[PDB]
Amino acid sequence: DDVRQYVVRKPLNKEGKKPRTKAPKIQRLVTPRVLQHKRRRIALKKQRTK
């Protein structure tokens, strides 16, 4: 299941401004950046060993 689908959003409607919806930033979410950081942490050990 996808977490990004099930985020609880907040409606936000002030007088004189268009209606809006806001959702929080998901924390502890596996993203390609996290995997790439782990990949480089692994890849530095190979350089040290060589």
Added chain:
RNA sequence: UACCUGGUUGAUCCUGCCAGUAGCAUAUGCUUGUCUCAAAGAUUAAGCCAUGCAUGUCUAAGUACGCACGGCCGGUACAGUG
């Protein structure tokens, strides 16, 4: 600038101090037109304090769902300033 002078006697030569002389640093008195520097509640009380200020800090890079502002899609995690 390696310097002296007056004072004890009726008069003289001495010892010997007092006073006289020139710097310096604290206060004080009188006086004071122009410019450059410049010390400044140490001395008696490390005695007592009204009031105000004198230590705070964010980058692309720890944590933003404060519309407090703000552009597009509009479930389509999180645009950006903060």
